[PDB]
Amino acid sequence: MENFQKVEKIGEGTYGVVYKARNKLTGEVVALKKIRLDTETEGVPSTAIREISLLKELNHPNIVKLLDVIHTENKLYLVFEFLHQDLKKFMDASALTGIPLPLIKSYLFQLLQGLAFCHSHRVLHRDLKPQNLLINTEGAIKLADFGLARAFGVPVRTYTHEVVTLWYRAPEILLGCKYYSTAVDIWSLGCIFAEMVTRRALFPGDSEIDQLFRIFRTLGTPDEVVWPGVTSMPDYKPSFPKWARQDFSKVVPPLDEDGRSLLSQMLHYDPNKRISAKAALAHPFFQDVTKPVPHLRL
Numbered sequence: 001m002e003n004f005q006k007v008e009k010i011g012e013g014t015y016g017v018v019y020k021a022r023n024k025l026t027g028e029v030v031a032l033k034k035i036r037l038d039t040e041t042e043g044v045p046s047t048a049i050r051e052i053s054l055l056k057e058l059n060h061p062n063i064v065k066l067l068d069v070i071h072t073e074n075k076l077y078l079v080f081e082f083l084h085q086d087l088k089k090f091m092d093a094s095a096l097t098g099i100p101l102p103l104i105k106s107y108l109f110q111l112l113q114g115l116a117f118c119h120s121h122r123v124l125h126r127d128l129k130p131q132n133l134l135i136n137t138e139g140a141i142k143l144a145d146f147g148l149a150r151a152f153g154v155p156v157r158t159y160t161h162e163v164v165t166l167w168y169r170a171p172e173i174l175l176g177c178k179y180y181s182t183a184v185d186i187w188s189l190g191c192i193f194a195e196m197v198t199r200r201a202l203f204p205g206d207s208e209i210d211q212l213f214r215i216f217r218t219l220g221t222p223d224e225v226v227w228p229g230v231t232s233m234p235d236y237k238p239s240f241p242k243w244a245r246q247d248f249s250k251v252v253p254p255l256d257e258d259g260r261s262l263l264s265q266m267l268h269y270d271p272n273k274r275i276s277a278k279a280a281l282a283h284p285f286f287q288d289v290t291k292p293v294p295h296l297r298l
């Protein structure tokens, strides 16, 4: 765009390149995202424009602010508030010592607040992953790209030919449910929570079926007792191997009883039984939550 001076390429997201750019008028550094490469023949649907415009109104201190929407030359650029680091980078940087529990608890608490806010307005993210969880020097964490999947139906091989991670995908999505709920976001967060604690991805599948079988090997193959209606799901197959559920004490050491209790509720098979963001904020796990300052050198 021309009202901005790019100052860097922050990377390549799901929808296009993300640049660090300086707004020439204001002088504020912002995150500029050019949307959808190649696949955009129509002239940018009025429908995505309308969904996006709605997001401009969704403001919360734990939601990365959508500053502007620029449909120029029949192209779309979303201007977001800029944050210096994402959680993926931070975790890689805390690989040897781990992220302290107090920090983990504060980050989870703030994430659940942003989520409860979006969920109350019937807005879903549906593509939560460490990469779109941004952190700053004050101890805050914010959810990036909330509601965009609804605007632009999420693909796997990006314009950069990159393969979209399935590691945080909820089982109802993997089994073909097309009317997914706010529960999908809680499943993803449960997975990110377990990853922060153990310093290893919970379910690093490399194909849809590998993703699903890794979930089954750990949580047990779902049946009609734990998930009523599972066997009627589109991609459900009577030929799925039947695996037993493992003990969470073995899955997420050394998380204490409160954390494991919370995690198991975030990881319920049945989307309807899964804990909501709102109820999770009330869990005993957060009784001693604080807001500590992270360790980052930019």
Ligand SMILES: CC(C)=CCNc1ncnc2[nH]cnc12
Pocket (backbone or CB within 6 Å): 010, 011, 012, 013, 018, 031, 064, 080, 081, 082, 083, 084, 085, 086, 131, 132, 134, 144, 145
């Ligand atoms: C390309 C990508 C995966 C990196 C992280 N994204 C972001 N990085 C930095 N500032 C931002 N503001 C909005 N989104 C932001």
